[PDB]
Amino acid sequence: VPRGSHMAKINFVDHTGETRTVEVEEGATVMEAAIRNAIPGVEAECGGACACATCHVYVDEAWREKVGGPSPMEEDMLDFGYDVRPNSRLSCQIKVSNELDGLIVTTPERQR
């Protein structure tokens, strides 16, 4: 919450394979790390209220265990995503912590 504090690196790989790295404060969500940095391929129609699926991302294999799977309420919204995979998550549901420093997520070809 303290601005610019305890920053964690988050790597956003778009559908073409181009990676964009940003730093976001611990406690913020991965969706906020993308929106605040104008990252392509990620949207936040509902602003992080788990009411849409436009913040959909694929969690890199190496980070799946630490990030975890989607919650039941996240699943219901994920049903509206495009090409939802086992490693799919709504980025606004992923809270950044120290152990996610270096996280890699890939944005899908389509959000809506």
Binding site for ligand FES (CB under 6 A): 31, 44-46, 48, 50-55, 77, 90, 92
DSSP assignment, residue 91? G
Shortest distance, position 35 Cβ to ligand FES, whole Å: 8
Please list, residue by residue across 21-47, b when 16 or more beta carbons sit within 10 angstroms of its beta carbon and e when fewer do. ebebbbebbbbbbbbeeebebbbbeee
Shortest distance, position 27 Cβ to ligand FES, whole Å: 17
Q: How far is CA 11 from CA 3, 52, 102, in A?
A: 20, 23, 7
Task: Compare residues 5 and 112 and give the one whose CB is closer to ligand FES.
Answer: 112
50 is an annotated ligand-binding site residue = no
CA separation for the pair 75, 16 (Å, rounded): 26
46 is an annotated ligand-binding site residue = yes
Shortest distance, position 108 Cβ to ligand FES, whole Å: 13
Task: Compare residues 18 and 75 and give the one whose CB is closer to ligand FES.
Answer: 75
